[PDB]
């Protein structure tokens, strides 16, 4: 894709994001800083922010 090989020390995390990612449909311009949080969901309810 748009990447080049680089050294990865032991313990690096590998993500198979293909078909397993949450996407925000809103379009944002470059240079903007965002703050986001992930809330877990279970049959008992949702995590308190």
């Amino acid at each position: 894709a748009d990447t080049v090989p680089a050294k990865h020390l032991a313990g690096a995390r590998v993500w198979f994001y293909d078909t397993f990612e949450a996407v925000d449909e809103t379009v944002y311009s470059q240079g903007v800083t965002l703050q986001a949080r992930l809330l877990t969901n279970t049959s008992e309810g949702q995590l308190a922010p």
């Binding site: 078909t19 397993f20 990612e21 996407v23 449909e25």
Partner: protein
Amino acid sequence: GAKPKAQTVGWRYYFDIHFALGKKVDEVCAIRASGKTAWKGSITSNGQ
């Protein structure tokens, strides 16, 4: 926009249950659930 990259239509539930059929038994023939023959056969010794 367009169709989502993937859709979560349903979930698959996995459970590990331990149960007893009573006192000593010799052979288990088949398992039937909801009127459908899930498994048919015969086992006479401890195994998978």
